[PDB]
Predict the structure of Flavohemoglobin.
Amino acid sequence: MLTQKTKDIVKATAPVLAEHGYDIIKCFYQRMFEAHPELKNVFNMAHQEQGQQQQALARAVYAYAENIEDPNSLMAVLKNIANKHASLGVKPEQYPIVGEHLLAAIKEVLGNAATDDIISAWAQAYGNLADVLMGMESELYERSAEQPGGWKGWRTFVIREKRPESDVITSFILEPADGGPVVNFEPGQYTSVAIDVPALGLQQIRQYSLSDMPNGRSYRISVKREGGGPQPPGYVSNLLHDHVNVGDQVKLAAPYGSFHIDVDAKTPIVLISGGVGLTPMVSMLKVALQAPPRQVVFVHGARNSAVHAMRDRLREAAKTYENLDLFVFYDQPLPEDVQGRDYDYPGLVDVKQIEKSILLPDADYYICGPIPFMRMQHDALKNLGIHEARIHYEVFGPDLFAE
Amino acid sequence: MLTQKTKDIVKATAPVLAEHGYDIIKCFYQRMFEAHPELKNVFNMAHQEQGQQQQALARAVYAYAENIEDPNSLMAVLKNIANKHASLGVKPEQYPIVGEHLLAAIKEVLGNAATDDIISAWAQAYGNLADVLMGMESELYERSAEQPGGWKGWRTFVIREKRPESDVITSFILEPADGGPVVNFEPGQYTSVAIDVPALGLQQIRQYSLSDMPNGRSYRISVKREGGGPQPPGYVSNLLHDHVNVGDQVKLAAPYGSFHIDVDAKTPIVLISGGVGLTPMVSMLKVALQAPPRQVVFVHGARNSAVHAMRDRLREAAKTYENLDLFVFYDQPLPEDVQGRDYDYPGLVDVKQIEKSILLPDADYYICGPIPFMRMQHDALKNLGIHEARIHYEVFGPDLFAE
Ligand SMILES: Cc1cc2nc3c(=O)[nH]c(=O)nc-3n(C[C@H](O)[C@H](O)[C@H](O)COP(=O)(O)OP(=O)(O)OC[C@H]3O[C@@H](n4cnc5c(N)ncnc54)[C@H](O)[C@@H]3O)c2cc1C
Ligand SMILES: Cc1cc2nc3c(=O)[nH]c(=O)nc-3n(C[C@H](O)[C@H](O)[C@H](O)COP(=O)(O)OP(=O)(O)OC[C@H]3O[C@@H](n4cnc5c(N)ncnc54)[C@H](O)[C@@H]3O)c2cc1C
Ligand code: HEM
Ligand code: HEM
Ligand SMILES: CC(=O)N1CCN(c2ccc(OC[C@@H]3CO[C@@](Cn4ccnc4)(c4ccc(Cl)cc4Cl)O3)cc2)CC1
Ligand SMILES: CC(=O)N1CCN(c2ccc(OC[C@@H]3CO[C@@](Cn4ccnc4)(c4ccc(Cl)cc4Cl)O3)cc2)CC1
């Protein structure tokens, strides 16, 4: 447990770590992978190139520092991390590994300025956080293992169906190879797919929102095929699209995540999604429409009808349920897309154009999409007078990028 | 923080670690020193061929496991370890190093039996303990640094005086090379000498009780020359006797230890020492005899007059102070030692032979000597009806050997 002086050295040196974040990260991964190459099967090797983990580092240290005196704030962010670590299968025996190489990297990068006081302060911070996280993770693993259909580690699933939703999104319906039950989850949570990537010669692991309601038998994910454009195609999404077919197997983690509706709440929900960001929203939509009403406004932004996932099922739902309001925004509508017919508004989701429809008293707001889209929606909701406690979000990259 | 299920795996598998302690200890040091040979400057390299560490490991894992549900019992022993680690200069950044190699060793020795559940439980135990220890050690370093004449790390001292006390015990009076004040200590506390051992080509560190009262200028240690007999001579004790002379320099730690008198207490103290175990007792004697009386019974066992340290000063004190009773037992008296004249009783310290003299109401008892001697005295004091809360001891090896 940290003394005041130790917290103060952390506060004082957080900017020093942040502005050297690039070199510390590079040195950290080089050291750590030289000593433990097997860990490349757990880390993302695509992010291993790009900015950008350096952005997240800077944000972590700065958020750690500004919150080191506020254990409640600290516990909440740690929960997001523990959930993500549990999904990846992070093990207690890995904390000393990561800790040594992280400290060796800080030491190397800071050179002469890596004084005993600084290294010692951060080494203590590291051990404090590690203890909190290992215990959270352990609790998460045990709760999953003990529930009906629950497990620890990887469980083999088989693809039962694979249904294209648009030119870029495809849904995979997944049942366990063993034919047994599958643990429940809160709508909004995710699984992780761990699969071998022959281009890399390594396993990679990626999270996917559980895009259907819980049913005890199967899970559904909806995977957007990534990239080409100007930048490299993504490893796992293309691999799932092109090489994982009906009857093939993948390994899945038990559901985790702290982004989810409270299923027991009477109160309204507003679901604001950009592109593939709709995936947790659909799960939330389908559970909420179990009356208990509850009142759902589904707000979705997509480029056009060619990329809009689950177009038909969503409008059919809005014709059938009183408590659902559907608003679709097309940013670049196709010649055959017509406003007021195939979608409601042109351009990006704009909350002012549906203000009365979304300002439901007692409402919780959920937001998922690219980070610029998320910050835009976040700011707009604040401008209406909605309290931050009522705004929730899940990132399709690192959860610390728009904090 | 540990879940019930994690503590349960610890409780169930302690015996497995204890049974394999020998191999785990051998593998742990091999791995650790291969990766960080510099740590050989901090560990004792007379573990050359020593099971002393396997004994202590087996006791630690069993004591830890049996107490894991009682945090108060756990905190108290962790204080003894924190004080010893602080004396050694153990650094927060070394916790991930020890943790990794310890876990790697547990994994290699247990082989097939190192299941995920077991490795995970002990890894969490390791991190939980590491956090508590680092925080205690940091608090200890800061308190020392902030006090008049205190410091962190090594401070250079010069031997001002070197006085033989018997054929085997020599005192060293030490003042700081910088000429500044030295920090106060509680009587019974120790320093650590760190010194280069050329036979080893390494620094070695040994604790020595501070054998005089605090005075703001100097420290005194009294060092028994170890070995020859049948076993190898001790490195540091022979080195100090033969090559550290007046004017030479050694490095010392600030005082630590949880074995000491309460200087502010009115109540009586009984001081039971075997051989070199008298050294903290003398400090405690000299402070207590500052009236505030307090009432001191100094009970000492030594083989004979040739080996009895500080013989003349102790009897002279007993002639001068009303509130001091002196009892000397010689186990193997020399022809020229006469009972009733040069010592009070033949044989080992036996408390029944001075029962009325030691059964002072409200008394605290302090015991220091070889472990068999300490258990003997401990048991005897219990048989008189003294509460365990009133019996204190400090070990000249590992503090967990007679718990
Ligand atoms: C909680 C959570 C839930 C998620 N839910 C979903 C979901 O429901 N549906 C879904 O499709 N995704 C979801 N994701 C995203 C998903 O996990 C993967 O990130 C996504 O499928 C891309 O994985 P990949 O292996 O295909 O791409 P990677 O190979 O890992 O590449 C990552 C991205 O970086 C780009 N890139 C790669 N290399 C470079 C480079 N050198 N320079 C610049 N750019 C580069 C790629 O084009 C790609 O867009 C979720 C993520 C999280 C954290
Ligand atoms: C809290 C504390 C306070 C202490 N206070 C004092 C004090 O006031 N005065 C004092 O003199 N000592 C004190 N000690 C003991 C002291 O710390 C040293 O342990 C002592 O001087 C021996 O160190 P050494 O380097 O000479 O022996 P080491 O070289 O460390 O060897 C340790 C012992 O093992 C034996 N040994 C070495 N090799 C072998 C072998 N391979 N096989 C079998 N046996 C072997 C040696 O003969 C020696 O006695 C204290 C210890 C503690 C923990
Ligand atoms: C106290 C120590 C640790 C801290 C503070 C920490 C913190 C973080 C943070 C802030 C994130 C980003 C969270 C997100 O995705 O939303 C993260 C992700 C991640 N962590 Fe840790 N962590 C620690 C230890 C570990 C350990 C021991 C491992 C085991 C290998 C680990 C492996 C990972 C991986 C694989 C990711 C996802 C990043 C990626 O996609 O490559 N972390 N952790
Ligand atoms: C959770 C982690 C740790 C635990 C539970 C632990 C526990 C202990 C215990 C029980 C002892 C015996 C104390 C004695 O001498 O009587 C000890 C001693 C010691 N520890 Fe640790 N310790 C830990 C970490 C560390 C670290 C990180 C270092 C850094 C080098 C370290 C270095 C030492 C040294 C040098 C000794 C003295 C033993 C010797 O003389 O060789 N320990 N520790
Ligand atoms: C928007 C987008 O497309 N985005 C996708 C996700 N992309 C990303 C991937 C991983 C990531 O990770 C977070 C940071 C980065 O570095 C570590 C790695 N780490 C360490 C322990 N557990 C994880 C770290 C953590 C704490 C400490 Cl103190 C030190 C370190 Cl070096 O976390 C950060 C970002 C970045 C790009
Ligand atoms: C006189 C002599 O010749 N002798 C005197 C006694 N001297 C001694 C040295 C070490 C010792 O050890 C106690 C325990 C047992 O072994 C470790 C080593 N260790 C680890 C961290 N700090 C020390 C240990 C501790 C905690 C954990 Cl979780 C794991 C491990 Cl393996 O200490 C006990 C005694 C060795 C030399």
